[PDB]
Design a protein around this nucleic acid. Structure first.
Ligand SMILES: [Mn+2]
Ligand SMILES: [Mn+2]
Ligand SMILES: [Mn+2]
Ligand SMILES: [Mn+2]
Lengths: 708, 708
DNA sequence: AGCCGAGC
DNA sequence: AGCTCGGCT
DNA sequence: AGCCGAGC
DNA sequence: AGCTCGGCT
């Protein structure tokens, strides 16, 4: 047939074609799983073809984009479909190579997404097939203990095995699935108007706001459900397209917003936060290859997606070039991308390295980890719902992402202006308004209207024939500008003749210099029309979707950055008071511990009590009879949810030496003074300390950057 | 010109061609290094072309192999050479695009090898060029502190930087090298007959035995030199081909034998031993990807070669299929290759894992590490000159390798027969003779003549038309046998008609079953001529080169395996006596330590001495005045090349509790009894213990293998 | 001519 | 990638 | 139409 | 690889 990745059913194309089934699989490992699953006998009436991934959404797409799509036309040639053909009459179905499509995907949410896009494809092009049951799915278990086809069903029911993707199952497993097909095969049924309404609601861009309402209800409902203790409702026999869209695809849509839409608190997405948690736990003193760090992240954070997406998450986190990260929390040791190509010139993750910026733990103090809520994946504690940085990182690095029904775009903001605004609010004033600010951007950004800005590079008149372009607007890449602006100006086009006579390039990996030559008259005309407009050095920047998850995990639209700043500020200063409470608890327990250590050893050297030959039971009983406390640090740590004095009896015999008692009394007095000194500090003073340290290191680091 | 990897000199092919120089580089990183080194001005008269690696040796090679060699014809087209053309007359040199070839390689030995093969190429095809100085080299530094062009020069001279390959130097470095070319450029000169004699000696297979004598002298000389303290002689101005061959290439030849020819002792090559040392130091409880283990080996063992060669070293170490390793010291967790394709079907090192066999440390006991001599790379201690296994592993896994002037081939041998021979020698008898034995090989191996054997698979007559082939001779691969034996028998050839009517394949990944169908008369004729001959189931195995490095590092040829066995036996039992000496030293120091601990604490509880408030100096002085020994373990460990009693004073206060004194007296008596019990054991009893444990685990492991 | 394997 | 190097079928 | 990025 | 998803030029 000409498609090498396809294994065609023996009876496909023959007089039995209508009884044949094409199995569309997610990935080629699923392909092999199904192939071995059917074996010799299954090969007659069952074809199997792989899909690379998410497919084209054909409902709104251009004609050229559809006609040039390799996968779509592969499925068309395999099944024998013809565009605009309706299938009712026997004469019409004589032309099909297969009578059914059985989609086999993972039992996770992205699988459901592929299911939905295939449903949308068939529903858009051939409703004649969709109404009559041309489409089926082959479900697999996500967990076993007997089999369970969704995590809520297994949780409600409650050796346990978790199945990540179809490739995890193998060998006999696959064959087992294909011996009993009554349980694993589910037919999509068309009930009526509700089905069409549901499909178009999911896959049409006219329905975006509808999707918003859709998802909103879901979120509220589930939270309300979660509040009242009602169990999660789950699927998995016939399944109507409506019930699929609203009870299954919807969880992909919500999971898509949850992974794609950052938190207001730390400005992170679950993947990024997993990466940073892993880095925090490893605490590498030396650089680590991005591929190896990626695998380590996967192990330690329980990151269940593919390695490529995570490696590029890391790369995106490390990028320091103009227009990317105002503060990069990972160091880009390697080629991580440049201003020239916009980062697309980054070297392979196998050949580049990274590690924590020395500002990372200054922005996310280690002690604050004791204030967070760490989540769990199958009894493995992984990473918190959020970190709580000393300043609103969601504003600094310009968080963005694309979900379903909502998207998020924020531009960057100067760290020092944000630090100053936090200081203003700590001193009881109102914050100043803030325009976006991009580190090392030499151009201007000026406020046009509400949430709209003009971003302009720099261009100068050198002389009558010469202009010098020293800056391009933020996110305009050097190579792209050359190809799409200066080169068309120089060579001219069909409609537009040549404006400029020549140009030359003086660039730095981090900077832009163009020297353009024009005729006298044509420069005069260009500056009459204005230089930034003619040379395309002004772009509009409009942020009307700032969508973030607040500290409750609720999606919220913020109209101004000052709202983000205030909400963050309240939360963060609350957590600073929490940090003081925790610190007086911990330091207080430590000081009591040091005090009972000192009393014990001071009485041993003073001769008040002798430990020699005392039985363990008799000694512990005597110690509790003499008033010694039990391990105040372990007791206070356990209290946050036999008597242990080991902290006293595991001390060295060196303890009773004169300089050990001396240094231990000094430690005791010093810890007491530490508790008294921190007790008199306000939480705001704690915050100001953190901010001062952060700016000291920020000046050192950025001046080292400019010197290098 | 059509070669994309080439950067051609601007003046190449023009009227200045004779003044142009083609730079042949080792690898493309060297190519880029030279490109940036010449810059804009250098590009006019200097071309640069990369070589993949070692090139074809054209002196003895087939005509087809030469005419089809891509690199050779690339250099010919680039320079403009013509085979059989002599270059003297001006008319003849009018046809060359370049006047000189400048070879730029690494300053290590393999670079010298490439230099030699280019010299051999030009000398073979065009002596007219070689006599007149057509060839130059561009040397680079191997180390800096000023620059040094060989490690012996730098050692004799003695921030220090070591240069591994040309790719380590970069940027300004390269440009520096090409600003001063008087120091870095060296011209090869043809003195006379000595040069030709030297080149042919190196590169001709008629000269193998000559090379042997050659290398022998060198080895002896250097050892003699090394014995008398005379410094190593080094090179690096003109260099004659003779002086190059005998003073430079020769060190590649010797290094090639040292890496390619295993030791008699542990049966390893430096790379393999580095791998196993790394595994021993990591002590992985879980599997590790072969790529990651490879990188870790590189870091910890100071392995200076490419990652591919090391990853395949690991793969070769893990292979358990019939005809590879009788005992695989690494576990093949993945697809590491099968009997079918001979291991060439192994999966990529990124997708497969390994770890230590549970017999690894039973064959190489950890305590024996204290008896070895660990080498050093730039102050980093890495791995021993050899390990000392409990049985001669060089016989078990069938060590082999190809150097210069010598090669090594040994077949495998049964572990249990070797263990039994060692037991025989420990009981004072002579060893039995041993034929080669391959684990899980169902065929036969029979002695023909001295060091020659017949290896035969298994074939049976089922009935008049049918024969069954259940075994192929060792190292004959299933796929290869099918393609080159059964398929030609079935399809016939131009000369030979078809002997067999059909065949079918019943194979297991680990086993071979062929059922062949023939005519009655033709089976009769085949068994008349014999079934093993007709069906190519007998191969000859001749081992007349068994070449190993003895325990002195001297190359030695062994005529029989019994010589290997005896030499190993003497060395190993010597090291068992050493192990007893070391063990009574260590256990004796431990027992003294426990005794002074017990005396101290027993006198503290008895009240004989009080430590409370005593000054550190006063206490240490009193302790040495009262007879307490100083840290016998640290003193005895230091003796193998202020007073420290910390081992007594860092004890817990729990020490003075009644059950701690009780268990400590029990530990003391138990260690004394341990010293007395091991003192009465012979070294042979130690060896027999090791052998018994090894066979217990060997039976458990191999029975688990057959069950799985 | 091809295979064996540590190297380029 | 296609090759080295020596022994051997 | 294309860009932005975590996913397939 | 070529695609999703929403906002915006
Ligand atoms: Mn999945
Ligand atoms: Mn960004
Ligand atoms: Mn090298
Ligand atoms: Mn082997």
């Amino acid at each position: 047939k000409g498609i090498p990745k396809l294994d065609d059913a023996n009876d496909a194309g023959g007089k039995h074609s209508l009884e044949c089934t094409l199995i569309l699989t997610e990935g080629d490992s699923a392909k092999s799983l199904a192939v071995s699953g059917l074996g010799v006998i299954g090969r007659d009436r069952y074809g199997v073809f792989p899909l690379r991934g998410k497919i084209l959404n054909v409902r709104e797409a251009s004609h050229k984009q559809i006609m040039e799509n390799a996968e779509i036309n592969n499925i068309i040639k395999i099944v024998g479909l013809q565009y605009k053909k309706s299938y009712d009459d026997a004469e019409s179905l004589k032309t099909l190579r297969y009578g059914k499509i059985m989609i086999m995907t993972d039992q996770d949410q992205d699988g459901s997404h592929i299911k939905g896009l295939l449903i949308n494809f068939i529903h858009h092009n051939w409703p004649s097939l969709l109404k009559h049951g041309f489409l089926e799915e082959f479900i697999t278990p996500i967990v076993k203990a007997l089999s369970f086809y969704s995590i809520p069903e297994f949780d409600e029911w409650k050796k346990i095995k978790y199945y990540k993707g179809l490739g995890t199952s193998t060998a006999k497993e696959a064959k087992e699935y294909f011996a009993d097909m009554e349980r694993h095969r589910i037919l999509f049924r068309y009930a009526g108007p509700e089905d069409d309404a549901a499909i178009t609601l999911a896959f049409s861009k006219k329905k975006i706001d509808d999707r918003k309402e859709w998802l909103t209800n879901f979120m509220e409902d589930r939270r309300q459900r979660r509040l009242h203790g009602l169990p999660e409702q789950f699927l998995y026999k016939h399944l109507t397209y409506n019930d699929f869209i609203n009870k299954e695809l919807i969880l992909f849509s919500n999971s898509d917003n949850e992974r794609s839409i950052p938190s207001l608190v730390d400005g992170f997405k679950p993947g990024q936060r997993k990466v940073l948690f892993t880095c925090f736990k490893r605490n590498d003193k030396r650089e680590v290859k991005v591929a190896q760090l990626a695998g380590s992240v996967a192990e330690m954070s329980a990151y269940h997606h593919g390695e490529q997406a995570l490696m590029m998450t890391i790369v995106n986190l490390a990028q320091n070039f103009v227009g990317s990260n105002n503060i990069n929390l990972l160091q880009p040791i390697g080629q991580f991308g440049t201003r020239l190509h916009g980062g697309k010139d980054a070297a392979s993750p196998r050949y580049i390295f990274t590690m924590l910026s020395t500002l990372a733990r200054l922005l996310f103090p280690a002690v604050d980890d004791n204030l967070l809520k760490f989540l769990y994946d199958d009894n493995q504690r992984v990473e918190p719902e959020w970190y709580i940085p000393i300043i609103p990182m969601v504003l600094i690095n310009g968080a963005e992402g694309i979900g379903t029904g909502w998207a998020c775009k924020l531009p960057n903001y100067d760290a020092r202006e944000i630090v100053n605004n936090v200081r203003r609010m700590l001193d009881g004033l109102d914050p100043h308004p803030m325009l976006p600010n991009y580190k090392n951007f030499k151009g201007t950004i000026q406020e046009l209207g509400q949430n709209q800005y003009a971003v302009s590079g720099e261009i100068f008149v050198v002389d009558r024939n010469t202009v010098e372009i020293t800056e391009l607007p933020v996110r305009t890449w050097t190579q792209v500008y050359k190809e799409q602006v200066l080169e068309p100006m120089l060579n001219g086009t069909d409609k537009t003749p040549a404006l400029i006579s020549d140009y030359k390039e003086y660039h730095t990996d981090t900077t832009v210099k163009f020297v353009v030559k024009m005729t006298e008259e044509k420069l005069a005309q260009a500056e009459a029309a204005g230089l930034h407009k003619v040379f395309k050095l002004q772009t509009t920047l409009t942020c009307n979707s700032m969508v973030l998850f607040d500290h409750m995990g609720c999606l919220k639209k913020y109209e101004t950055v000052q709202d983000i700043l205030k909400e963050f500020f309240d939360l963060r200063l609350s957590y600073y008071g929490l940090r003081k409470e925790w610190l007086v608890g911990m330091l207080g327990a430590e000081s009591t511990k040091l005090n009972n250590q000192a009393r014990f050893i001071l009485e041993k050297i003073q001769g008040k009590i002798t430990i020699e030959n005392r039985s363990k039971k008799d000694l512990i009983q005597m110690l509790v009879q003499r008033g010694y406390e039990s391990d105040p640090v372990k007791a206070w740590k356990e209290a946050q949810e036999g008597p242990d004095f080991n902290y006293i009896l595991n001390m060295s015999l060196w303890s009773l030496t004169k300089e050990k008692v001396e240094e231990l009394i000094k430690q005791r007095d010093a810890k007491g003074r530490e508790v008294n000194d921190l007790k008199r500090k306000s939480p705001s003073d704690l915050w100001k300390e953190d901010l001062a340290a952060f700016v000291e290191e920020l000046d050192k680091v950025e001046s080292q950057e400019r010197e290098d």
